[model samples]
Target: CRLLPYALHKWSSFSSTYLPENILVDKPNDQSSRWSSESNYPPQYLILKLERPAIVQNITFGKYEKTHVCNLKKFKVFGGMNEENMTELLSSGLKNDYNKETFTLKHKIDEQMFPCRFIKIVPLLSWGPSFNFSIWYVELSGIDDPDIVQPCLNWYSKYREQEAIRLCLKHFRQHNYTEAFESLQKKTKIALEHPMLTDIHDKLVFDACEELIEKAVNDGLFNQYISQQPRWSQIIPKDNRPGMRGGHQMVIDVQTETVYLFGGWDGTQDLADFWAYSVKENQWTCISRDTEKENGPSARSCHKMCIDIQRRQIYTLGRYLDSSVRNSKSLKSDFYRYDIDTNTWMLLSEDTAADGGPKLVFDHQMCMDSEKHMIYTFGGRILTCNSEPQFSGLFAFNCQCQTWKLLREDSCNAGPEDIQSRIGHCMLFHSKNRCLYVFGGQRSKTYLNDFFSYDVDSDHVDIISDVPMTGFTQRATIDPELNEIHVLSGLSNSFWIYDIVRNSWSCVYKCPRFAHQLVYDELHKVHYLFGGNPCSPKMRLDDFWSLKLCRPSKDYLLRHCKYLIRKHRFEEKTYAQRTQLFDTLVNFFPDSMTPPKGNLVDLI
Candidate 1:
């Protein structure tokens, strides 16, 4: 009943040492021709290249009775057209006893009837005295009808290859360029041709598909089989674009679909250039000379800007590099406003009330409470390292009144010195809760991953949670619908999501980045990441990447929903919180109906 060809074919060895014919010939009961382990490792593998693709039906393993060595405990079988893109076809469980006669075993293969031209067998565990294992014989039965085998086998290989490419693409789409390139190189080596390597290498270049791919990958839904290349038509931008620069600030005007970018260091001068990118028209217009050059704020880098969506104005604050000295400053408390309609800049008085504005600060974070027409700023260096200074606390600036008021001087009330001082932290405003979430920063010699939430209405600060390590120069965006804040591109290559309601942090993926900016597009439901340094040798980047945080795949949504639901039910929290979680599930699966405990239903 065996359909396997008897003709001997080429086989390769990756084990310490073994005979090639030990894998070629088959004997159900013979021990003389057994394959034995030579390495100290308990498990070993055998790789064989078949003469033709075949649909394997069954594989049987016979016992080894030599040297009192262990028999096979558990093993897996993988089949592919080549070594690189093999798919697991079968795995055996239970130990194969040393009793030669009774230890023989048979397992079904290819229940799905997929064809393979190469096979690999890996013995995972040993059964007896030593870490060594032996296989007396390996036999397989399969069909070799070319018409049914070849094409399907090819398709299967392509499918597996595509999966690897998708993983690499996901890394790339997250702005983890280092990991993305690493992933692409690794997967392409295994799953694709050398020509594909060159093609992708060329496309991922600085001037090629970098920015386009960043936009395209996030603009649409992605799956495993999606083309590794983005739809080029969607990236048709206007003639001129922004050049390579770092320390720039970009804010999107939701109403007009325009992105405004402010001053940055271009590796030479501190550029005060302002440019606007039109989302609808795909154009970049230089709006730097609004009113007059001297009328605007001085040219600077490492400054912070926030957009008041309601007021149609932008507030710029805090700077490091001064135009003349180029010396970094701890506190540049000067504030300015940019009117979108008038194309004019106005210097706002820093003085408010009897006490002055926030102690001169730099490298701090700012977010707009558009509803209340105010801005909240937190955590910046007060002075140079030589001078002793107080920690810059939470401060609120009234947009209309042009006044600064110190809110909370410390995040905790342990003591006066208990204030948490952090510079280079990121602050995100949660519109739903009217709270500001702050995460990641450096305080003197210490880097922090501590998370905190400040209630704007109550002026109260609550420590939420902490991350594994300190995060700096990280960018974060929120999905109000899901109550998740995605933090990306920091000193670490980690991608984390902080659950607002749950008050916990969970990492989703990892890849290297730093000094980047992440903006949430509420309309598109995507997070757009702009330029930053991707470590050394790569220099400063002009690239962009995005993540679809809200509209993730149904499987991802369901998996997290299950986790949240299980955790909530286990903790026995408020029914209202659980109901909110359920409401989120319903948003993703509008067609799904809730099921009682012990039962499951589709999230269709």
Candidate 2:
């Protein structure tokens, strides 16, 4: 998933000389760079040990220059567990080096049963008599055997329990439950409490799923629920709509059943317009009248917006750019709120440095705990290598007191950073956990993948876990009931769900959305995604999409419940915490297990 041409050392040449690795890349020809055989007199074969055995479909052969006849005009491909055990799968006559030949292996073509772990390319005749049998570039595609094959019960008998035990022990210790770790350690003798270590949640969730799937494979239920795309539909609202744009801000007011959107870059310039979409009516209503302009936020992109759901009010702040300073750009720091009941916009603040407020910033995250009417802002660019000190840390604004408080900060005059300074990340408050979760952003050019949890009551920061698709502008919504944080990448086609209690990230789906806003509606049981580009070249999308998440099959859930009952090692927490985890499991995979009429402990 990280950049550049792959440098895996899986290719080899037999009786060949001069750059075997050159075939590994698509390098421009300087007339001398190519993989060449020692001599054309002998039949030279190139072999590739695949990263894993694969159901390879086809292979393509090419080089930078054609008809140099250092190229083979005819070749054959053989595949099997090993080169010596291989049988010829296909052979194709290349017209010339100019016409790169792509031959589909005949095994899957005629008999789609076995996978090839190794491929041998034996060159037959060269385009010219004296020219060496040569290769400059080659590439192949396959359905990885791992994804296609289910874990065998043989693997379970050998390694599955050990894997699950060690993983559970690791999480147990990291969550600071050494007692659980101690009991497990005595049973199997492995525990990892290192705070910085990644959790096995990703692997273990699949372990849990596959364990249930064994019943599936045995009963022919494996045909069900093979990885399918989320049921997503492009929403078409009634009447005039917002034009195509990106870098805007949006928030939902559950009380009013409305989602309010504010200004963004419309490809060319900043926009100050504000609009509201009614969840019930599917209507877009413009709220940015001339009178409202006096109190509304300025035309901008990369701004911050959040809703006070309890109060039915919306707040906006800071932007990347405005109409002013045409030649140069600086962060804009204006704050405003719109009252849903009163139909009015109110200015909250304007000065960034004044009254201990956050420095002029854009790309920061802000959320409100409306019970106290206090807003918290965390991490964004304020220039010049900011740390979790100088311009970094969590800042809180008391709506009543009208003052900013640095709730958590690393003293610049003292030690290292806590949470690194970042832009294009997410910060959302989990009301049930009474904790703030921050994840995935960029600090300067480096993309951050780590996650942090700030306990609001204790004012302590716990360095939690990390995920792979940790990059800029990923939006997240927390489901307190399910204890899962659904995150959609704002710059790539990756979607992940972070199980907070489990401390693991599960890649749930892959969608063609980047630089988008994602909001989840608990009551409606769906997620709303709006205004993101699918790919580069900036063809911005104004289309809105919704996905109603699906529950796992009752059979899968029953199997899961049975497995948990049989292997109740994770039941090491107090009744409350254990129940939370179990309830999350039951709620997330509804209909999988019956809820206990009395105490959940009795269900076992």
Candidate 3:
């Protein structure tokens, strides 16, 4: 009977430490049909996906040189409860067209081995003498498990422990403990401390755990349950910049959670020193072009830097440096990316690999659909250098295909009045609304406070508002839920939030200066603002402040309670106001703050 035909798919194979693995191919026709090893063989396994129905009458191991053993069938399979049980199980299922082998390895494997229900092989080291066997490769046909692939992925993910925990917690509620634990172990590292939640470990472990259990008893993963508790605190301090930019562009490292602040004119020279903040250390490290040969982009202001979070690269586009006009820089169509891992910078070239993205673009807004591995860049003012402005007539880049495909022209929804050539306008992605909202900038002879939404999937554009702004730039960010967009720190010190669901706007919090950039951290429910005019000489804010949002009910009660606590000290003329304030506080803070004794107070 003919044995199954299999193929090997590996880049390269090597021997263990100190000894070079020099494998000698065994001749198929030779009487000494076995293979051997030079030293203790390396542990290797086989992986096979069933393509057709065929079975095991003969087998061979090792990637021998010229002479190869075609059909030597002297190996044993033993990876389950017992050899007898495995044999019986296989024998019983042998009649089934899709039945596969389980005891394909010699020794009893770990629990993880079960997830890899496919065929496995471990050849005896003594099969040959001159250094053979110990070869790792698997080949089989006649079995398939499409849905069961996830379980195998989960098992393999345990290579990282805390990731396993985080994954475990997330999927636990869904009864996908296997997947959760795998992610937790791989990304979160169960073997190491939960560094991400170190600050809130004690609180979450005891109090939060108690609360979570009460809320979600026996909920397998409980990801949504734990997230509702706010038991976790950010390990990184406020010093870290969320990759802020002065006027239009920004890039953030989602992996390291490091923020790189670049671009923006300072009246004199264009600001170019690169600042890198570590989320782990909560410290800022300044990187200059002179610091290292290939540290960052050149000194250019008003450009934007976007990060391909999945690819771990930062792309900087469109700068206006060496010009008196804020919109008039040596407008760069050239794109460059800074790799945090390699600490290297390179121009973005077309990638041909699966999901490859396009080349250089400038002033054009760039944002990533992370889950999709694609980047979208809208219209941006490009200097024609001949006293006229040019816009990037709509273009979309496919990273997977590494090609730039232009969308329909005039597709950015700039109406005839709003369509005049413009740059310096803010492009904020309203994820909840599934639209890219554009606001405030000069269009040739006119400056605008017009609002427009560019539908991402449909390439449809619509004007939402045309109210003017006193500030040169307007910034907006969508909350985690994407229901409302909080627009803050514009030409005026006013803040407004646009509700997508309601199709309306409301006044929110106001800052003291023009906010150059804003980002909402959904994980912490905080709005981090950066690059505002500090209203001082020779200075802009290099620091960041967080706007904490409280429930409306809580805010009202807290304000009223504070008013009553100091009511007696107020003058008689202010008594009425104080009474009203006290009533408000009572309403806002319905929950009493009982002073706990000793350590409990300290803990609170």
Candidate 4:
């Protein structure tokens, strides 16, 4: 008759404000075992899963330091061989004996006993010293027959699901994600005769399940039902296709739901090819060939492009054409526009001065304000004597007048100059808030994670938040559905989401890429991501992906529920209960728009 290490598995309705694990620990004192619940209601219960099937003979409830303030008056113990089939074992009838209690207490079970793996203790009455109910330690003593032990050992001997989980956790700790997932997949297949495992089984599987579910959910871009694998269709070259390259530019035409890609660098040369991908047709159309665009912007990379839907035009500005051609001297500050309707390109102006317009800059960022008919641009380097230079300027392009004017020449406001000069940064126009957000890029000698917003109406700039990680490269898009700016993969695989309304940042997913291009299709409600060097320096890819911005479908919910049930051999009622919980979660935090409403009750 000894207390087992795995006596505590499940707890019922515990408050996150207090530590629930405290009550099950060995020799818990006042500080260790005080579990509190601020709920004023009575008949609160705490349930525990036993390490093995046990015939309980004795139980103890330790009291707090010196008072009966947190003592229970009357309680009942419930037991079950299996979890879902529980029966009341002893109802210690109502008794308010708080006035005659010592620091330590004991309860003797007088009813007929049976072997049980699950035990539940309910406090029917509490000494009303305060509204908050508190509990100290719960101790149990039970017998395990050698026959019962032999049967249990035989059943779980080779079915080492716990060992598999531990192995997965080891890989996770070592940052070996591929191996961890492989090990997790192995544990999901291990089988045992009993439906309920020991507390150790519960603890290990809980961590493994949580980690797998989170990774799967995020891989599908926060959509729980979808798998990370997207529908990919390749387009054979009917005429000429954009070659494999990185540092390219992509802009979406919301009206046509088409993505327009511009200049990038191939291994051998700088590419000036222009192509358009249609979401509806799932096809690529070469709009302008490299030889066909001799009059347009020169062959380059690290350039910025913005679209004007009103006039059906695409504009390109400031690019690092070539570094060997005298470094900054080869960078282009000239701006050009291509009319989608006419299928032609023309130079807007030859002037590149800081007097009244934008300076000669490259590797900058730009976003269009459709409502105001303005294109906001910021953060690019101007060629100087130094190798690492910085540009600290913001400019606006008026479509009507076709002129660029400097908004903030240097700093934002009267503070300590929060916004710094940067290149390779990204900006997006938040139409609802009438503000432009700028985040991540390279400063003088360091990469940046500082975020800032520019108010279009007030002509003011303010620093918002500093992101935790660094190495961001011009890859981001605005989701009006969520009213948040999503910064996709850059130098790192991490994806960050910024809530415009709350002004908060959350790392939602770890995407696969860097130097990639992201374009959001308002019509399809999908984010289209194109070619990038997922692994820098040596690797260049031509793959494309689409991420839907919506909640998981009913099919996904049902399948996910069934999968969890089968994997863990959860009790029958567990599926229905978990469905309700997941339903509540989606009702409040339905990650994306479209399918305006979600109900998971049908899953049951």
Candidate 5:
């Protein structure tokens, strides 16, 4: 019924015309002017103006060599039109067409690929144009199934969003404010509401949190800076308080930025004094004597203490005297709570406390799981006023109910007759998994180098085989924001960080030369260290230090690129590699298995 060019043959008038029917169609002299084909390329371009929104999916841009003969440069797709001029409306990524350097490339349009409605081409740089060359015609097919392929784009989009969130969290946790703020911009749209994002916005600055998404959008750019600076530094005298010999039990109130150092014994005397220091003001306030609780337990060392940020109280458990003669016979199972705001002391007895009760008397190990309201007490020496030796036992206390439960021997894979005790080491609580990771210390006169994770919920324990050395002491802190566990300044000033996501361990900066205590202030979000004598044991250096976690750099784009490449299969070699890797260990063997042998005829 209709014909545009007369030079080519025409088929039945009732049916759609073929490519050859239009032989002498309008052809411009320049590449851009060519209506169908670019001047340098023999293939003619096919322009499609769509009435509805459409995304080119599973479509080859470059004219396949099988269609005709021509030097096809590069092809592109564009979204909603920018101007009547099609060239101005062309989609963009890199600068030049890639014909001379690369061949007919077929890239599946996915995330980071391209988004457009119009598909155009740039041919070899040339001025002459006839457009009669048969290869200049670009075939447009597969235009019907946009819905089937749109899901790939959506998947890629979501992946990018999540990756950006991950990077932002990492950067913020490391305390790199500039880098974190810069990255916070690139993730503006996502920043407004992200599930994985920690409450850094609300925790640090309310106004900043409210403006974070807006600020990110205004910048339209991200800059990530990685400083080798440590995240912790200790402010001594201001952050430290001299208490009796209890170097093992320490609590830092994250809400108030106060460190409460309890009683412990020095070489000469047992200390029962309690002191508190304000992190922001760098000042000290002693409170133990003011409480005036005559019924309170005596001064002891080798205990454990944790600050309950939710309850605004401190749960202190157990007491120990380090003297070899005294520790052999006596230790105290005394659990108490100090109300921070009210300045009151209350005993956490089984009937009064929500955690059930106080744990058994133990030294060398202690930890608190605030989420579970449970305190784990492991391995300690028992002492008596006139007895010769102390007893060894493992017990756990429930701070919520203030009740104590003796761990059954069979509960932790311990034999009915086994009574192994742990002391002189440290315990860290992982709230997410509800497990107490215990490592180092001494048990039954043996200096231990091993570690174990006791699951309170499961009533089971497993060993952490990777960590080796543990002697004088061990200290650990959990960064719930990072989902990581950090163990610092072990027997030899070594620091180890365990990644919960990767299930791997990495080394960090050497532990500061602090001998007394290296603790974390959750409220101020910094680390502190105190007391170190490099050469002399007599001179116990009573200095303080702080460790501040710096935000990690944002490499989200780079990581996402690698992740995309890992998921897709491009070549036969890649396919083969993936198959080999997946099959090496797994036996996807069918029952009554028979290996099929393939010959040429069989393949056919």
Candidate 6:
């Protein structure tokens, strides 16, 4: 209904993930597909149509792989409805690799009032004949005429039938099959079998055949959903694996296929040992090296670490001081940056009073924005309780400037503004929206389960649709591309997943024990659970396991689920029960925040 680049109708098989339609995807950076032309000479071009009629004054183009770019040069943009009526839009040259250029259409594209749905691009020139046209992505922008839009959608119910009739009419007029072109030159009528007509003497043979023809075609073309019942199975690498500990933190470096773990609470004392899980090699190795071993940050637990995947660095801060050493002398706002490649600890910032830093905080949650070199941190027990409650709110640490800015302050005493100063909470960042989702944290033993999203840009706070009754967890990770959050560790046995867009949570598994440190492998779509205790920080757990869950792309999923509606039925004792399954599968991927009604297994 809106003029967004969604509502895709172009079709393909299981390889649908890599198609020209991907140019319309929301997050272009995450796409692994590229669109290339078949032509081998100048003016090689491709034609596409936006779902809705739009003015389309702005056009974005890019090269998918910067390293393998520009075998092409200039582009001549053109737009309009049909071939004969289209108009020239622009002539723009290419840019540096990876730099997406948004070209404004020529003044005539808008001055002439051309509301375009179909647009063609012609590459006017290139370096060589072998360098075929390539486009990583494209974005359309202009005004949408709500006054006249959506007026033709309801009348075009049978898409295939309309096309068939269109071709039939064209053949009759062009070849004199019916010889009516002279009289019917100004008007055309489309006839669809009405619902009432279907009830009276319906052609059962062709009707039923065509009714399920697309479904049957999808059955053979699209792959069925592989029902996966993945559980957390324990796996221990046979090399100096860290022993039982709780309150420690771990972060994954998917770029290096390594999981880095640091300071955790042992059963007796806080341990400062660091270890790395070389996931690709299935081995564990100690990479904790310092010019002077004790020169690194002191041993502490309840601290958090966020990794910069691009630079292979882990930033650390916050920790719990045990009963004896809870004094101000042993506590300091120390931040360390560990270079995974060099095995070096760079002390980025530290202070006795934490004047310009995240002062002595413990059990805090933090995640890094690698692209911007910023970290969003929230929810931890601050050392000085009498200080202003606002000091405990979410803060942004600019890695470039080495400073902290409180984004939104919250009260620890009264829990005002839904931005309560929390501990054991999840502060996950969604870069696409520049927002952070904070959930399942608390002040003291309050066990607040209230979930809220904080807009980092506008300092706006929004209460999430629903929340767990009473929960506290300091562990969670997000698939930035999928807009989903997974909490694999906490006081509960049930592992939970929160769909950011859907505004709901679902449990994928109920494991035996709870984890203290959970890191995600983005490339593998697996969340690794390191040593964890059953519930509290009183014991060390040597258990190591992983849980994998990432739904397929929406395009492929919708195609597969649509087919399931026709042939997916099992163990249904009654007719009513059979269709109930059909309804669940059909509405699997909703286009709204309200999730589909179904069991976790089916929804997952």
Index of the highest-lDDT prediction: 2
* Residue lDDT tens for model 5, 1-604: 1111112221112112324323223222223211233133434344343333234333223322232223332334323222234432333222123221212223334334332344444333222233222222233333334464366457656877765554554344334345446466465544422321233223322223324433432342222111111565545563335632325355777776777776644645656667787777887677774333644556655566677777777776665544564532243345677787787787665221134333344554566777777766666665454433344455666676645776633122355333356566667777768877666666556677765677778877676552536435456777654556777654336677776554666767654343356676433457776543334344344556676666543244324323433443343222234323222211212211211212223323
User: Which parts of model 1 are misplaced by more than 4 Å?
Assistant: 1-236, 289-294, 322-332, 350-355, 384-386, 410-419, 466-468, 491-493, 535-538, 546-595, 599-604
* lDDT by residue (tens digit), candidate 3, 183-290: 444544342222322222223322233343233223322222222211122333442333333453444454556666666555455556666755456676765533
lDDT of 2 by residue, 1-604 (tens): 1111223233344343466766677654544456777776555677776766556667776655546766677778887766668888888766664555566777543333456677777778888877767776677765664655223323434454765565565445435555544676667654332111112222232335435434533553222221111677878887478887777778776656778887667677767777888878888888763325556666667778788777777777666643355222244356777786687888877655566877767678888886667788888666322133234567888888888888866332322235565777778889887788888777666677767788777877777764555455577888765667787665445667776654666776664556677778765556778876663555788888766666654356557656764454445423445434443443322121222223312333
**Candidate 1 colliding pairs:** 331-360, 331-361
Runs of candidate 6 with Cα error greater than 4 angstroms are: 1-229, 289-294, 352-354, 384-391, 412-418, 465-467, 489-492, 510-515, 535-539, 550-604
Q: Which regions of candidate 5 deviate over 4 angstroms?
A: 1-248, 290-295, 322-332, 349-362, 384-394, 408-420, 466-468, 490-492, 511-515, 521-524, 532-537, 550-604
Question: In terms of TM-score, how similar is model 3 to the real structure?
Answer: 0.45
lDDT, candidates in the order shown: 0.61, 0.63, 0.44, 0.62, 0.48, 0.62
TM-scores, in order shown?
0.51, 0.53, 0.45, 0.52, 0.48, 0.54
Clashes of each: 2, 2, 53, 0, 72, 2
Error of 4 at 564 (Å): 23
Candidates sorted by TM-score, descending order?
A: 6, 2, 4, 1, 5, 3
Q: What's the lDDT for residue 596 in model 4?
A: 22
- 397: Cα error in model 3, Å: 2.3
**Model 3 error, position 238 (Å):** 9.9
Worst 10 residues of 1 by lDDT: 224-233
Candidate 4 structure quality by residue, lDDT tens digits, 1-604: 6664345565555655556677775343345455665553654677777766766655666655455545665567777767777777666632333222222112223332345667777766667745545566667666666575455445454444554454444334224344335445455654221122212123332325444434434444333223211333333433345678888888888887788898877666788888887767777887777623447876777778888887778877776644447444444357788898788888876545532566667777888877878887788777543233558487787767876776776553545444565776777788878887888777775777778887889767687765546665547788664576776666555666777665777766544567777787544567777777763465787677776544455346546744664554454322344433333333322333211232222222
Residue 546, model 5, lDDT: 71
